[PDB]
């Protein structure tokens, strides 16, 4: 970083790239890339700066440059990972896959009672019931939050937008939240209200959670049992269910010069190269965003030794993004997340809770 400093003082063309990385291995692994690139490019540097907010907020101004207009070729990119940085058909950022929803499970407890890993939503609910009765407590653990909702919503056929408008109270939403509530009422679903699911392990019998791929090593550390990772149960049986994918992006403000744009283009192409993607992913547990990364021997070798990581990557292909609206962080936490809490912990009627949520969301979005 002080190495990025040395490199940008000496340089005459400086391109500013804005990212949403906080700290830890991800920020380190990005800086690493900046350093490597700068060392190949004497006279011009990249400066990686942490952005304050998300891409919908910056795009409401039109504060960002279109990636492809810098001259960046996005062939080899898995296009499904651009869903959230695509606005009116134009790509405004190069994404990173911070996490994928996966099925964490207890291998020893499923074996103990002869229960196959569920491949469908209906086999999952049946497995939850059977193992709950067997162990005398609810074995499907869940945070009552928009992330757990998303999994059930997406795999009962739900979509957040209908003809461009946000709908929190569709029949798919009611059906999802009703499924979770009945899980609690029937003794198979355990709400986790204090700390991460992995911070609650050991308090009683656990069989499964749907939770972020980012929690992998924390699930490993806390599991006093053989930990499994599988793809998400879906409605039909020959493919994984949809999982929430969440993103950190790299973007560039529309002010930058031609010279700066040539540097940013070379940098973003570097970041998208197979070995850059493979080194970043192996260093961080992130999922690469290119098809080329998956054929890079550094990815291939890491995947070969880390079958739980190969499973996280297989899930990544069956990914949905949350809506790309400036207000979405607020709706997800203060409005949708509240209706979910209300239905799950205070026995609110699922329909009446999501109807109140819709009204509050329509109110916030029309201001």
Contact (Cβ atoms closer than 8 angstroms) between residue 76 and residue 290: yes
DSSP for 295-312, written as a single string: GSHHHHHHHHH-HHHHHH
**Burial class of 355 by CB neighbour count within 10 A (0 to 12, 13 to 18, 19+):** middle
Contact (Cβ atoms closer than 8 angstroms) between residue 81 and residue 95: yes
CATH code linked to domain 2-97+247-305: 3.40.190.10
Q: For 284, phi and psi rounded to 5 degrees?
A: -120, -15
User: Which single residue is written with the structure tokens 């930990």?
Assistant: 227
127-130's contacts with Cβ under 8 Å and 24+ in sequence apart are: 127/207, 127/208, 128/183, 128/188, 128/189, 128/207, 128/208, 129/186, 129/188
Q: Which residues contact 305 (CB under 8 A, 6 or more apart)?
A: none
The residue extents of the domains of the chain are 2-97+247-305
Solved by what technique? X-ray
Sign for the CA dihedral angle at 82, 85, 90, 92 comes to negative
Tokens of 35: 């350093």
Q: Report how far residue 367's alpha carbon sits from residue 62's, in angstroms, rounded to the nearest whole number.
A: 19
Residues ending a continuous segment of the chain before a break (C–N > 2.5 Å): none
Q: Report how far residue 89's alpha carbon sits from residue 78's, in angstroms, rounded to the nearest whole number.
A: 16
């Amino acid at each position: 970083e002080d190495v990025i400093k040395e490199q940008c003082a000496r340089a005459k063309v400086v391109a500013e790239l804005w990212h949403g990385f906080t700290g830890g291995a991800p920020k380190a692994a990005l800086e690493n890339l900046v350093v490597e690139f700068n060392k190949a490019q004497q006279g011009r540097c990249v400066r990686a700066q942490a952005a304050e907010n998300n891409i919908a907020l910056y795009l409401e101004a039109k504060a960002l440059l279109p990636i492809e207009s810098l001259g960046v070729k996005l062939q080899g990119v898995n296009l499904t990972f651009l869903n959230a940085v695509r606005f009116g058909g134009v790509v405004y950022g190069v994404p990173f896959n911070k996490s994928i929803q996966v099925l964490y499970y207890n291998k020893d407890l499923l074996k103990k009672h002869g229960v196959p890993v569920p491949a469908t939503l209906e086999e999952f609910v049946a497995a939850a019931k059977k193992l709950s009765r067997a162990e005398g407590g609810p074995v499907y653990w869940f945070q009552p939050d928009a992330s757990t909702f998303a999994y059930f919503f997406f795999n009962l056929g739900g979509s957040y937008l209908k003809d461009g408008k946000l709908v929190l109270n569709s029949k798919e939403a009611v059906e999802a939240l009703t499924l979770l509530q009945n899980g609690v009422k029937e003794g198979w679903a355990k709400p986790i209200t204090s700390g991460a699911i992995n911070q609650n392990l050991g308090s009683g019998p656990y069989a499964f959670s749907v939770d972020t791929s980012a929690g992998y090593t924390a699930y490993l550390r806390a599991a006093k049992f053989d930990l499994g990772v599988a793809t998400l149960p879906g409605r039909t049986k020959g493919q994984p269910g949809y999982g929430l994918v969440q993103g950190t992006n790299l973007v560039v403000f529309r002010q930058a010069s031609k010279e700066e744009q040539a540097v940013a283009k070379d940098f973003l192409e570097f970041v998208l190269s197979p070995r850059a993607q493979a080194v970043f992913a192996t260093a961080t547990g992130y999922v690469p965003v290119t098809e080329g990364a998956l054929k890079d021997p550094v990815y291939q070798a890491y995947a070969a030794e880390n079958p739980d990581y190969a499973t996280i990557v297989r899930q990544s292909r069956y990914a949905k993004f949350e809506p790309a609206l400036a207000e979405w962080e607020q709706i997800r936490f203060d409005i949708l997340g509240q209706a979910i809490k209300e239905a799950i912990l205070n026995k609110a009627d699922p329909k009446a809770a999501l109807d109140r949520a819709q009204k509050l969301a329509e109110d916030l979005l029309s201001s």
